[PDB]
Amino acid sequence: SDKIIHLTDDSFDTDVLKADGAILVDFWAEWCGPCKMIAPILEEIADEYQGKLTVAKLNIDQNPGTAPKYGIRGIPTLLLFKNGEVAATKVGALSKGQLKEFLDANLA
């Protein structure tokens, strides 16, 4: 999206590891239905949390290098980073409501 950062293996360090703030990274794939189901929701979140976090997506087929580094086994997986370090791990599709709660609880 407009506000979502579209990540690559090469831009991962700069976009995620070096950002001064919180980043919600979504590891996903085109063949993964639940990944597709959460896409519109990640869009709303990126609007609503503007100034508090940035949403980023890494497609793990197009960028196969980064997932192994974080032990990612299954998708979708959402990893909350705070200044380069994973604060919180979430796995599986959740609803908008569940995601708000995940974020509010871990951003404090």
Swiss-Prot record:
GO terms for cellular component: cytoplasm; cytosol. Gene3D superfamilies: Glutaredoxin (3.40.30.10). One of its GO terms (molecular function) is protein-disulfide reductase activity. Disulfide bonds join C32-C35. Transmembrane segments: none annotated. The record marks G33, P34 as: Contributes to redox potential value. This is Thioredoxin 1. It comes from Escherichia coli (strain K12). The gene is trxA.
